[PDB]
């Protein structure tokens, strides 16, 4: 997970020192979602529905042959054993053709279904690789917030998707500025942005708040103070400065 | 028409859908790419444009200088797709087909 | 509308007259099809009470609390200012729902609760904590696989109706292999997709996991049948029928 | 009637396109559960929105 | 009769091709509008912003 | 199956007969369909056996 983090942006220190705190909000995740498929069987409609959809389809096509499809009965032993041969094949016309407008049209239905499922098995098989097997930058196709792991899980006639988001919560008003004018050249930021607290400019993640003190290291000199705009003035803290004594 | 064909109503108004663009529109600009990955937090745009800069390899302070520069483009850009779409209408074709 | 004086009636682009002129008296007459419509029933479900609603599509309140919306005549209805999430969708943006001495009302859709952010040069929101969550995705992937026989089927047990399907050609030999095709491209899908991987890989007999617990998602051995914790209720919630 | 459901059958297919569409519409236009606006005083940077 | 399963048969289809383009569309929004897009031309050509 | 003393023929949800009742000496005989199953072929290539 220190990787992880680092792909959405996030300092690898704060998993080893919040790992702790993790593994409360991590294992009652799970337990959630264990209650809510139990108790609410609503979660599940989307396969339960690709399951009804079949059956009212297989009993359709067993009604028809209860109807008689413009013959005199839908029994095929009573019209055989009372109408003559001619006159039947008259009345079996009807019948063939009423089940064959039935049967061809319960296949194209299941040709137009098959392509709606094909759909989403390649969406399935996609969501395997990227959000489970892989780790994908893309937002919101593994679920809301910035995607860490997905864990597969096998259904019936279908796939359940477990998904580990990572999702910021508390923020706080702050004050940055564009840039710092130190020696008169513009200091820009290599990572993080630049926030302050109405004492003293620091450099913190975009994800996550670190306050540190402004070093050559996390900034480059870039440019002059007189073209960035809304740059402001501040100190530059050099480790050298200090090393100079030994 | 008059056969019995039924023309039913959206299930949301031009109004309704209009609604969620503006949502959108107003959300990318004061919250960044914040908002869709989670709570809603405030960001400066001139430092938008700056951290999309460097995603795609290219250094922020490109921004800050060219700024200038980069606000004739844009508001030219936009200038031009108002007179493309009123001139010509055959771009939304895929849409009246 | 004027009609010609030489042409007594008239017809729209489907061939269908929408007006007339009196045979006897000179006027223009035109015809509009008697009110008809879709009849819809918004009530909620048999466990939470019976109060049903009755709405009307595309025409306003005649046969016949009638309330009129733009989808119709809406009758069984009380009407609130009060826009909420939405429940039972109508139409023309406007949802139903049971609430409160409970009946159903009907109001407008609404889009989520207002949000503003605050926009200032130098303001700037850094998160001071973060919260994970899991979210579950579910999607089909295999479909029940039918295999239906159009010999048996058309004709039951019958030599002589069987004669009449000849005639037909390969309209009963074109049918099986288009139920066929759909039965194989069943397997290809959990192929492509359950498995992604040659090899089969099991967790070690010491489990550390550095604080998390994953016996809710790992296979338990005890049971009969190997699999996870969650993948059990999944089987139990998603349920002869075949036989007939 | 004789003809069997094929009349029942017609009208479930288009009531389910109906249904879908607006599912299309909830799964695009909405990205959000909420609404955002932008205050009073508006700086795009030199931009014109 | 056949008149209606010509036309159903044919919004069925043209509603799988309107459905796709949906899915297209959600899925812009999400790596081109929300996020941004590191896919090459997905967003149109040149880098995405 | 105990089938009501008024009541002889029974019938399934396909309205196919579930079972009977012999007239001349009165019992119920439960009738399973007959002919069912398929016939596959597996057989390697020609050229191969």
Same mark, same amino acid.
């Given at each position: 997970?220190?990787?992880?983090?680092?792909?959405?942006?996030?300092?690898?220190?704060?998993?080893?020192?919040?790992?702790?705190?993790?593994?409360?909000?991590?294992?009652?995740?799970?337990?959630?979602?264990?209650?809510?498929?139990?108790?609410?069987?609503?979660?599940?409609?989307?396969?339960?529905?690709?399951?009804?959809?079949?059956?009212?389809?297989?009993?359709?096509?067993?009604?028809?042959?209860?109807?008689?499809?413009?013959?005199?009965?839908?029994?095929?032993?009573?019209?055989?054993?009372?109408?003559?041969?001619?006159?039947?094949?008259?009345?079996?016309?009807?019948?063939?053709?009423?089940?064959?407008?039935?049967?061809?049209?319960?296949?194209?239905?299941?040709?137009?279904?098959?392509?709606?499922?094909?759909?989403?098995?390649?969406?399935?098989?996609?969501?395997?690789?990227?959000?489970?097997?892989?780790?994908?930058?893309?937002?919101?196709?593994?679920?809301?917030?910035?995607?860490?792991?997905?864990?597969?899980?096998?259904?019936?006639?279908?796939?359940?998707?477990?998904?580990?988001?990572?999702?910021?919560?508390?923020?706080?008003?702050?004050?940055?500025?564009?840039?710092?004018?130190?020696?008169?050249?513009?200091?820009?930021?290599?990572?993080?942005?630049?926030?302050?607290?109405?004492?003293?400019?620091?450099?913190?993640?975009?994800?996550?708040?670190?306050?540190?003190?402004?070093?050559?290291?996390?900034?480059?000199?870039?440019?002059?103070?007189?073209?960035?705009?809304?740059?402001?003035?501040?100190?530059?803290?050099?480790?050298?400065?200090?090393?100079?004594?030994? | 028409?008059?056969?019995?064909?039924?023309?039913?109503?959206?299930?949301?108004?031009?109004?309704?859908?209009?609604?969620?663009?503006?949502?959108?529109?107003?959300?990318?600009?004061?919250?960044?790419?914040?908002?869709?990955?989670?709570?809603?937090?405030?960001?400066?745009?001139?430092?938008?444009?700056?951290?999309?800069?460097?995603?795609?390899?290219?250094? *922020?302070?490109?921004?800050?200088?060219?700024?200038?520069?980069?606000?004739?483009?844009?508001?030219?850009?936009?200038?031009?797709?108002?007179?493309?779409?009123?001139?010509?209408?055959?771009?939304?074709?895929?849409? *009246?087909? | 509308?004027?009609?010609?004086?030489?042409?007594?009636?008239?017809?729209?682009?489907?061939?269908?007259?929408?007006?007339?002129?009196?045979?006897?008296?000179?006027?223009?007459?035109?015809?509009?099809?008697?009110?008809?419509?879709?009849?819809?029933?918004?009530?909620?479900?048999?466990?939470?009470?019976?109060?049903?609603?009755?709405?009307?599509?595309?025409?306003?309140?005649?046969?016949?609390?009638?309330?009129?919306?733009?989808?119709?005549?809406? !009758?069984?209805?009380?009407?609130?200012?009060?826009?909420?999430?939405?429940?039972?969708?109508?139409?023309?943006?406007?949802?139903?729902?049971?609430?409160?001495?409970?009946?159903?009302?009907?109001?407008?859709?609404?889009?989520?609760?207002?949000?503003?952010?605050?926009?200032?040069?130098?303001?700037?929101?850094?998160?001071?904590?973060?919260?994970?969550?899991?979210?579950?995705?579910?999607?089909?992937?295999?479909?029940?696989?039918?295999?239906?026989?159009?010999?048996?089927?058309?004709?039951?047990?019958?030599?002589?109706?069987?004669?009449?399907?000849?005639?037909?050609?390969?309209?009963?030999?074109?049918?099986?292999?288009?139920?066929?095709?759909?039965?194989?491209?069943?397997?290809?899908?959990?192929?492509?997709?359950?498995?992604?991987?040659?090899?089969?890989?099991?967790?070690?007999?010491?489990?550390?996991?550095?604080?998390?617990?994953?016996?809710? !998602?790992?296979?338990?051995?005890?049971?009969?049948?190997?699999?996870?914790? !969650?993948?059990?209720?999944?089987?139990?919630?998603?349920?002869?029928?075949?036989?007939?």
């Amino acid at each position: 997970m220190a990787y992880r983090f680092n792909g959405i942006g996030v300092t690898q220190n704060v998993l080893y020192e919040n790992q702790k705190l993790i593994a409360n909000q991590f294992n009652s995740a799970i337990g959630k979602i264990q209650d809510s498929l139990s108790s609410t069987a609503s979660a599940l409609g989307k396969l339960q529905d690709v399951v009804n959809q079949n059956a009212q389809a297989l009993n359709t096509l067993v009604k028809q042959l209860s109807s008689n499809f413009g013959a005199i009965s839908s029994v095929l032993n009573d019209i055989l054993s009372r109408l003559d041969p001619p006159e039947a094949e008259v009345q079996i016309d009807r019948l063939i053709t009423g089940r064959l407008q039935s049967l061809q049209t319960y296949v194209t239905q299941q040709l137009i279904r098959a392509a709606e499922i094909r759909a989403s098995a390649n969406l399935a098989a996609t969501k395997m690789s990227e959000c489970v097997l892989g780790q994908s930058k893309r937002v919101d196709f593994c679920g809301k917030g910035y995607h860490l792991m997905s864990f597969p899980q096998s259904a019936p006639h279908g796939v359940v998707f477990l998904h580990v988001t990572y999702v910021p919560a508390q923020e706080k008003n702050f004050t940055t500025a564009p840039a710092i004018c130190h020696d008169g050249k513009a200091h820009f930021p290599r990572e993080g942005v630049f926030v302050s607290n109405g004492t003293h400019w620091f450099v913190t993640q975009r994800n996550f708040y670190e306050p540190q003190i402004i070093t050559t290291d996390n900034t480059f000199v870039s440019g002059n103070c007189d073209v960035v705009i809304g740059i402001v003035n501040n100190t530059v803290y050099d480790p050298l400065q200090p090393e100079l004594d030994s | 028409k008059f056969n019995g064909l039924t023309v039913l109503p959206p299930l949301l108004t031009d109004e309704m859908i209009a609604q969620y663009t503006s949502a959108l529109l107003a959300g990318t600009i004061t919250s960044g790419w914040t908002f869709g990955a989670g709570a809603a937090l405030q960001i400066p745009f001139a430092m938008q444009m700056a951290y999309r800069f460097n995603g795609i390899g290219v250094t *922020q302070n490109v921004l800050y200088e060219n700024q200038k520069l980069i606000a004739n483009q844009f508001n030219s850009a936009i200038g031009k797709i108002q007179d493309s779409l009123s001139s010509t209408a055959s771009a939304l074709g895929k849409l *009246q087909d | 509308k004027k009609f010609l004086p030489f042409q007594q009636f008239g017809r729209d682009i489907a061939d269908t007259t929408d007006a007339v002129r009196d045979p006897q008296t000179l006027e223009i007459l035109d015809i509009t099809p008697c009110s008809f419509g879709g009849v819809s029933v918004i009530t909620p479900g048999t466990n939470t009470s019976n109060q049903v609603a009755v709405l009307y599509q595309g025409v306003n309140c005649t046969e016949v609390n009638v309330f009129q919306t733009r989808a119709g005549c809406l !009758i069984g209805a009380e009407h609130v200012n009060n826009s909420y999430e939405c429940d039972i969708p109508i139409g023309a943006g406007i949802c139903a729902s049971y609430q409160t001495s409970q009946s159903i009302i009907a109001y407008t859709m609404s889009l989520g609760a207002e949000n503003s952010v605050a926009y200032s040069n130098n303001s700037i929101a850094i998160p001071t904590n973060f919260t994970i969550s899991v979210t579950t995705e579910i999607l089909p992937v295999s479909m029940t696989k039918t295999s239906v026989d159009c010999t048996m089927y058309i004709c039951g047990d019958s030599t002589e109706c069987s004669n009449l399907l000849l005639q037909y050609g390969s309209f009963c030999t074109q049918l099986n292999r288009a139920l066929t095709g759909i039965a194989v491209e069943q397997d290809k899908n959990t192929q492509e997709v359950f498995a992604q991987v040659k090899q089969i890989y099991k967790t070690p007999p010491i489990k550390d996991f550095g604080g998390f617990n994953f016996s809710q !998602i790992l296979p338990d051995p005890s049971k009969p049948s190997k699999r996870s914790f !969650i993948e059990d209720l999944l089987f139990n919630k998603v349920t002869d029928l075949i036989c007939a």
